[PDB]
Design a protein around this ligand. Structure first.
Ligand code: PUB
Ligand code: PUB
Ligand code: PUB
Ligand code: PEB
Ligand code: PEB
Ligand code: PEB
Ligand code: PEB
Ligand code: PEB
Ligand code: PEB
Ligand code: PEB
Ligand code: PEB
Ligand code: PEB
Ligand code: PVN
Ligand code: PUB
Lengths: 245, 177, 164, 164, 164, 177, 164, 99
């Protein structure tokens, strides 16, 4: 029989996986700080996507007159799938998010201390960096036949790297209910055409930037980096393993 | 993404000088016009749904090969993508009406559509027909000569603005072809 | 450019909606503040030369060490360049004043100015002496209307508060 | 809520800027169009009862088969639901009408209404018959001021154009 | 298409495995259900005309107001359209019945049907009256084999439960 | 994010009825106020750079332990962060000035700030001191009694609005502690 | 574990659908092939001891150098280990045989076995000699039923083709 | 690059054959300058402004159109060539243009 009667403490797995729980009742404080902290990183990089003040082409968020709300439903369900993970997936995500945040920190001691210090910021830092820089997979645009082909091949080899088993994981999650699929298809096509309508200046620094993610995540290898010099969309195709997909 | 103001400013920046009195005078014609544009955009954006329905339905009515198998309107999938395309077009056209310049329409919607329809095998003549019916029905609502819905507005002349809106639709219909 | 109608059309495009009555009231405020603001644009296009001349003359009246032979502006060509730079600044105040908002002024003048001015040993306090000289020499009833003058004040202050 | 000042605030907050003169003109248009649609809001809070009553009565005057014993509205409780539903709708038109924009009406009534109405076999054409009845029974000079009336028309049309 | 063998080969392809005995058992289930279902596809290609005729006739027998001059189906050409549309539905039931699964019937009929039918003022309750009329006119031993008939029931119900 | 309008609407929604003339009368006081709030926001947003600089420099002046080694202002990095924190605080205060309600300030900035500063070891008393100095500087600019810069405005009564802005600064300074 | 039920369920869960008739035919194939597979599982649980004994004895009959004093299996305790490893494998063949598919056999035995075996200086060709010995000593009609025997064959081949 | 929905993880990516893509701009330039060179030498064939005897392109009431059909088919045959003939043509055309 539990000692507590009211607001009997139920730390979340993430709270327990992390070091937040402690003597001072910090678990309220640290977890709260991570939530506030994560949104700060995201708002910073959303400030970098729109310097001028008007929302870019990246942020249109729906063409059909009710598709925005559909994106709101989909975002919350995806966070719910992020919350339904097992133990090992959580520790795997915290370590790989940790190391990738450190490799993106470019050696700043202070930042490295604050990535080991807070699990939540590191992960939203990774995602939001890769979205603001326009360097990860959604923002790939093939420009030959061979880029399109090798993004198919490279993509397939990445999905075989993620699910060696035949059983579909939680991450693919395309639909929650009926009629979800077609709507996700609609918005997914609108994303790619939307990327087609980016400004010329941005696309060039996106290419360079996807090459820079290619040199990092590929490794110091003549072959892979030779291919990234041949075709820059492959550097966008290097997802992290902390995604499933 | 540039209104009438930003268009005058950009043209004076390529000219490298101050805007001056003359450009401000044309801009005072815009500002002095004003609520005719406001009420005009209210008219189009009011009956927008109905415009889209009628225009695409009419487009299928002139040639029933679209709904025939092998036509691009043969399925629910393709018909729904057809309807959303008509809707998006009318959306950016309304944006172009509040803007006063077609910059938003050129950059956000027109830029990359032709290649895409060519790659998807969308029949372009039929699209220009859809744009033409949305043009005519939109000008009929914007002149308040629509035979079904006729609302009270304080009278005057708004013909030049109708010519502007017809110019935007002709820009879209000339771009899809 | 950042402006009223581009913020609202940008927000409707980012939202994916038809432009409702909110954007209509925004452009209503645009077409109502426009008469007052443009007038100031007319007078700026009137006497920009004396604006630049008093601005730069008072700028070196405050900072004499610039024409000394260390610091940059110690040659006739660079005093010409400094005057032209102030002429670009007043032209951007005219542009953003016509547009409405800070868009022309931000994206042409402010964005990336820190690297250029920090690179080329350019002090901001000289510019701020020039703009605050113009802002103190502005007056109240005699040249302009007061209301439109406030618009001018705002734009000039924005430049100062985007500089240092 | 989607409104003038919330859109400008969101735009400034998403950008990370101070609110410049552009947002000031937007809220200027808010404060200038305000009196009209607030008058219309007052009158809607005046006679909403008769509005809902004539709305639903003309709605079943058009579609009689709903009270037949297939289709949903065939019991006294569900005709009470139909009237109650229309009362919600007019109150949202009042709310959005006071706010300025379509915000109260979108985020409470419109968003995800497709799933609800399509799930519970609720036909939209009955609602549209009600709203078009009220919008056609409206008036130019007798009850309202014309200008404000336009605002009312807009909000009601938006409901129709968010339904079908 | 969504089907047995496409689900399994799709799973094996995504995974990057050889098709093991699990997929062989899946296609075993396909080859075991197949004949009973195909027979139902043969009879549907037999008598689709009378199926569509009784379906639409009972559909307007229930909903009379459609041929009234508001609601859409009030012209001979659109009652023809209504009849042909059902004919497409029975053809999709034949196709998905042949394939095995809901693949062609989902991707050709159900995908994006909400936008189209909601746009063009088409009530779903008329369709559901038609399909449930055919599902109630189904019988047991007299036309079909019982087991195959269940497959037919499934497909038809799927359409209903994808409509409302 | 809720302004004055949405606060009236939310209160009427919790009451579950229509708007009514009383709440509309208070809203007529808001809209009838109007350009006092416009000119006020123009004043604070004009001299924003000066207030952030002066207030944070004064905060370092009252206790030099911040710039002392071990203090949270001892480095350029930590000083830069503090400068941006004071700036963002004044930014959301100005947002709450245009809004008329503190909802944007409560949601976007205030929600979990104390816990954050406690987790980072930011001294909260020093932050409340900085918010206090920005309070007094901002009220002095908003009443146009600043001793350095005094711009011409048509006179009237602005005390209630000053009380509003002081209420927002007291909300922030009460929140950080 | 990869299994017919899991494959179908994963496909429906990843898609976000109710389980349609496609999964039903897949699990129909499962419930039809089941008896043949189960019978083989009964006999494997029958005589696993003698299977392991002949397996390992023929394994060292081929490779004698393993009991030489370099290579791993050179003491009676480590020959006990070699036997245990083979016993694990036959038991995983029994598990996967009862399940249907290669799921438990893959995720318990095969996954990451390359690093373990290559780490501890373990040759795979010794395992392959053992398994191919059992597969060649198998039989058609004398011990088992033929059809179920095919199931056994498949699983054992899988082990071999997952080893090298 | 055909603009065909390729998949990369979560969302399909569309291939850019327009605007910023450099190959497309180069291809457009060649066609434009090619027609430019043609119209310059056609300006040299007819200096006076009357069309020459060489440009008659027929005699029969429908033979013009026949020539138009023949020209398009000849371009199509140019496009159906093998690898080595295309590289051979590019190099020999290059050295003859140089000479
Ligand atoms: C519900 C949408 C709507 C309202 C409200 C309204 O007042 N009228 C429509 C929009 C509308 N439609 C047109 C123009 C044309 N519409 C059609 C389509 C119909 N004509 C047919 O023969 C058929 C099949 C029987 C249909 C569905 C056509 C062909 C035109 C004219 C095309 C042209 O080239 O001009 C208009 C503009 C005319 C007007 O009403 O003022 C509007 C507003
Ligand atoms: C997540 C990365 C996924 C992994 C891993 C995987 O193997 N497949 C992903 C999840 C998945 N998706 C489906 C089903 C559909 N997915 C659709 C969306 C795509 N189809 C399009 O046309 C476009 C735009 C070009 C997109 C983005 C659609 C549609 C379906 C079919 C919907 C239906 O009604 O059946 C599935 C199930 C199919 C399968 O792969 O076995 C899975 C696992
Ligand atoms: C920024 C450059 C400023 C201009 C321009 C201006 O006119 N005054 C500046 C902003 C300003 N500051 C205050 C209020 C206070 N400022 C304080 C800081 C200074 N006091 C010190 O003792 C020291 C260290 C020696 C510094 C840096 C303090 C303290 C206050 C008063 C705090 C309080 O509780 O009231 C004001 C408002 C007063 C006014 O000038 O009208 C303004 C506008
Ligand atoms: C009144 C409250 C002041 C006063 C104002 C004076 N300004 C004088 C001259 C002058 N002022 C400007 C700047 C002004 N002109 C513009 O067109 C604009 C902006 C568009 C500004 C900011 C210029 C360029 C000039 C020279 C040309 C001219 O004479 O108009 C002025 C004349 C004498 C002088 O230099 O002071 C006055 C009196 N001066 C005062 O002392 C009170 C306080
Ligand atoms: C038996 C349990 C029922 C019974 C069945 C009857 N159905 C009759 C006629 C009829 N039924 C259909 C639908 C059916 N035919 C098909 O081919 C398919 C599907 C492929 C279905 C669902 C049609 C089209 C027709 C008309 C043609 C015909 O006569 O076969 C029928 C004849 C008289 C009648 O209409 O009822 C019967 C008796 N009716 C019963 O009362 C029991 C319960
Ligand atoms: C909650 C925790 C938390 C952090 C730890 C930071 C981490 C962080 N730093 C930056 C961003 C930055 N961080 C640095 C810092 C560096 N300058 C260098 O010379 C060194 C290598 C390094 C200091 C040791 C710089 C320079 C930028 C801006 C980079 C740029 O724009 O080029 C950004 C992107 C947003 C921004 O521009 O501010 C983020 C999320 N932010 C947070 O919210
Ligand atoms: C179409 C393009 C395309 C690529 C560019 C590659 C990229 C790639 N490499 C690996 C996988 C790998 N790549 C390397 C290569 C490296 N060894 C090192 O010492 C260096 C850091 C680096 C060479 C410079 C290694 C060692 C692995 C296996 C990693 C492991 O299993 O630990 C994988 C996972 C699948 C696999 O194991 O093969 C993929 C997708 N694959 C593709 O389909
Ligand atoms: C915020 C929303 C918003 C609107 C929707 C408009 C509504 C609006 N329209 C006009 C005013 C007008 N509106 C029209 C419009 C036209 N008359 C015709 O006969 C044509 C059918 C139609 C073409 C568009 C005309 C002609 C006037 C009067 C002329 C003018 O004021 O320019 C006025 C002036 C004041 C008044 O008349 O009382 C206003 C406020 N303005 C706004 O602020
Ligand atoms: C669109 C807006 C816009 C501006 C505002 C300017 C700003 C600007 N000034 C310079 C460049 C310069 N600007 C100055 C000006 C100065 N001389 C001094 O004594 C003073 C400190 C100061 C005048 C008050 C000088 C001297 C240079 C040349 C610096 C050098 O080469 O050393 C440059 C680099 C390119 C060049 O050499 O011209 C730029 C971008 N240019 C623009 O396009
Ligand atoms: C592949 C499958 C497939 C379908 C199932 C149909 C579905 C469908 N029906 C219509 C369109 C239509 N469908 C009907 C049918 C109806 N008339 C009524 O009285 C009844 C409610 C109903 C018959 C039961 C009518 C009347 C139209 C025309 C609607 C209009 O233009 O107003 C349309 C729009 C294109 C068109 O006008 O033809 C589509 C996609 N089409 C397809 O490609
Ligand atoms: C678009 C931008 C925009 C602005 C920036 C304001 C500017 C503005 N302020 C007032 C008007 C005024 N402004 C103030 C403001 C104050 N007076 C004081 O002594 C205090 C220092 C200060 C506190 C904020 C006062 C008191 C009035 C006059 C009273 C009133 O009109 O309510 C007026 C009325 C017309 C006029 O005076 O000519 C206008 C347009 N309105 C706008 O539309
Ligand atoms: C669930 C399935 C499962 C298996 C299949 C085994 C596989 C396996 N075998 C060993 C380990 C071992 N396996 C053998 C077996 C061999 N001796 C030889 O002469 C032959 C080559 C071979 C028998 C045919 C030996 C000798 C070791 C110990 C190796 C050593 O320590 O040197 C280990 C390391 C841990 C340990 O020491 O036990 C593992 C994981 N374990 C499992 O959990
Ligand atoms: C290419 C970078 C990248 C992205 C964008 C990514 C994940 C990802 N973000 C996605 C979506 C997504 N992420 C964002 C954030 C964002 N977009 C931007 O332009 C900027 C500057 C952002 C914040 C850093 C938006 C607006 C969306 C679209 C709206 C929505 O879908 O919620 C998606 C699509 C489906 C989903 O929601 O999961 C995916 C798969 N993984 C990546 O590597
Ligand atoms: C919890 C899961 C979740 C999300 C994720 C959001 C997604 C979201 N953004 C919206 C809408 C939206 N999004 C943005 C863009 C965004 N805002 C900015 O100011 C900047 C800089 C942006 C990019 C960084 C804008 C500009 C809007 C319009 C509303 C507004 O004025 O802010 C809307 C409203 C849709 C509609 O109107 O139909 C939704 C649902 N909502 C959720 O529930």
């Amino acid at each position: 029989v539990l000692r507590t009667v009211l607001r009997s403490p139920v730390p979340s797995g993430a709270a327990t996986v992390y070091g937040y729980v402690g003597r001072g009742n910090i678990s309220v404080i640290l977890a709260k700080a991570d939530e506030y902290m994560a949104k700060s990183v995201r708002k910073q990089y959303l400030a970098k996507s729109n310097p001028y003040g008007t929302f870019g082409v990246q942020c249109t968020e729906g063409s059909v007159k009710f598709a925005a709300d559909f994106s709101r439903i989909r975002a919350l369900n995806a966070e719910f799938r992020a919350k339904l993970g097992s133990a090992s997936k959580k520790t795997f995500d915290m370590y790989e998010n940790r190391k990738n945040a450190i490799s993106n920190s470019h050696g700043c001691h202070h930042e490295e201390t604050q990535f080991v210090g807070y699990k939540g910021v590191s992960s939203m830092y990774n995602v939001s960096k890769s979205e603001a820089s326009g360097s990860c997979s959604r923002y790939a645009s093939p420009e030959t036949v061979v880029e399109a082909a090798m993004l198919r091949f490279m993509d397939i080899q990445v999905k075989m790297a993620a699910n060696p088993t035949g059983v579909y994981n939680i991450s693919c999650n395309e639909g929650a209910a009926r009629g979800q699929a077609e709507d996700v298809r609609v918005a997914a096509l609108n994303a790619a055409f939307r990327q087609g309508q980016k400004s010329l200046g941005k696309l060039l620094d996106e290419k360079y930037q996807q090459k820079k993610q290619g040199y990092s995540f590929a490794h110091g290898c003549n072959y892979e980096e030779g291919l990234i010099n041949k075709y820059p969309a492959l550097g966008a195709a290097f997802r992290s393993k902390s995604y499933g997909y | 993404m540039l209104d009438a103001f930003s268009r005058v400013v950009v043209n004076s920046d390529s000219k490298a000088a101050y805007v001056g009195g003359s450009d401000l005078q044309s801009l005072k014609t815009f500002i002095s016009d004003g609520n005719k544009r406001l009420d005009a955009v209210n008219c189009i954006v009011s009956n927008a749904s109905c415009i889209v329905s009628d225009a695409i339905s009419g487009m299928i009515c002139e040639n029933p090969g679209l709904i025939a198998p092998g036509g691009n309107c043969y399925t629910n999938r393709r018909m729904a993508a057809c309807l959303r395309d008509g809707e998006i077009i009318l959306r950016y056209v309304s944006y172009a009406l509040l803007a006063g310049d077609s910059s938003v329409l050129d950059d956000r919607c027109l830029n990359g559509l032709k290649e895409t329809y060519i790659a998807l095998g969308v029949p372009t003549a039929s699209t220009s027909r859809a744009v033409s019916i949305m043009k005519a029905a939109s000008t009929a609502f914007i002149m308040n000569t629509a035979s079904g819905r006729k609302i009270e507005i304080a009278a005057g002349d708004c013909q030049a603005l109708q010519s502007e809106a017809a110019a935007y639709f002709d820009k879209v219909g000339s771009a899809v072809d | 450019m950042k402006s009223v109608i581009t913020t609202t059309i940008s927000a409707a495009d980012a939202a994916g909606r038809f432009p409702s009555s909110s954007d209509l009231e925004s452009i209503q405020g645009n077409i109502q503040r426009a008469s007052a603001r443009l007038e100031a644009a007319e007078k700026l296009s009137g006497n920009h030369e004396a604006v630049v001349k008093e601005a730069g003359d008072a700028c070196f009246a405050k900072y004499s060490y610039l024409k000394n032979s260390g610091e940059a502006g110690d040659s006739q060509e660079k005093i010409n360049k400094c005057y032209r730079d102030v002429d670009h600044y007043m032209r951007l105040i005219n542009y953003s004043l016509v547009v409405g908002g800070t868009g022309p002024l931000d994206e042409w003048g402010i964005a990336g100015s820190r690297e250029v001015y920090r690179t080329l040993n350019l002090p901001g306090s000289a510019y701020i002496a020039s703009f605050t000289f113009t802002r103190d020499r502005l007056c109240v009833p005699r040249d302009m209307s007061s209301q439109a003058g406030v618009e001018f004040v705002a734009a000039l202050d924005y430049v100062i508060n985007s500089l240092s």
